[PDB]
């Protein structure tokens, strides 16, 4: 697992860890999954935790998350709100804030720049995939 990967997984971990206590509870999984338009059942949430909870304590810590970590089009659809096939800074800034993240336009712009391959100022589907593959 590369250094950047552990750091990306750390970032993801932080997005679920609402209280910032080093643990992801079922409540946190549900809350986040509902903010993105999902509707998990208590049983499905219990099973997610169960399927990767090594020490059987009922919550996932960063190390367990790591093991777990160690579909694109659907994720693309969450970012591309207006459905035009392109993610713009404003759409990106929306998702980020939705994830509780508070960031500067400059930062949202740098993020767009990181994924933008052809340099049109937005992220299309192929560029979104490449960034994930």
């Amino acid at each position: 697992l590369t250094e950047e990967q552990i750091a990306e997984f750390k970032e993801a971990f932080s997005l679920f860890d609402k209280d910032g206590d080093g643990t992801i509870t079922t409540k946190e999984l549900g809350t986040v999954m509902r903010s993105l338009g999902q509707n998990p059942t208590e049983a499905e949430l219990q099973d997610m935790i169960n399927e990767v909870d090594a020490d059987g304590n009922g919550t996932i810590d960063f190390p367990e998350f790591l093991t777990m970590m160690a579909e694109i089009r659907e994720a693309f659809r969450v970012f591309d709100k207006d459905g035009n096939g392109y993610i713009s800074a404003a759409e990106l800034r929306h998702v980020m804030t939705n994830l509780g993240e508070k960031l500067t336009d400059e930062e949202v712009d740098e993020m767009i720049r990181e994924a933008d391959i052809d340099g049109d100022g937005q992220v299309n589907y192929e560029e979104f995939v490449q960034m994930m593959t």
């Binding site: 990306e8 750390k10 993801a12 997005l15 986040v32 579909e71 980020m96 993240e101 740098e110």
Partner: peptide, 18 residues
Amino acid sequence: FNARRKLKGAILTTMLAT
């Protein structure tokens, strides 16, 4: 601020949430 890290982490999160 690491642009690629913050973006991929949020994409991973939505990818898992989905």
